[PDB]
Amino acid sequence: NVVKTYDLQDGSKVHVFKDGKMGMENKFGKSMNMPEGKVMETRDGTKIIMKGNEIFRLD
């Protein structure tokens, strides 16, 4: 049910699900609370930020 996963530099992951929803886990894979309005760097060199329960990606 995961359509996409952002692999973040600090070891955490954000899963985007088929249902529209979004989940985050730390480097150990335990669930995290998702920050809002906080820029997060991916391992493939992009930046994302979460807001209003949506993901925005650097332009």
Residues that bind a copy of itself (CB under 8 A): 37, 39, 47-49, 51-52, 54-59
The smaller minimum CB distance to a copy of itself, of residues 12 and 14, is found at 14
Residue 34 sits in the site that holds Cu ion (CB under 5 A): yes
Q: Which residues contact 29 (CB under 8 A, 6 or more apart)?
A: 13
What gap in Å lies between CA 34 and CA 53, rounded to an integer? 9
Residue 50 sits in the site that holds Cu ion (CB under 5 A): yes
The smaller minimum CB distance to a copy of itself, of residues 7 and 54, is found at 54
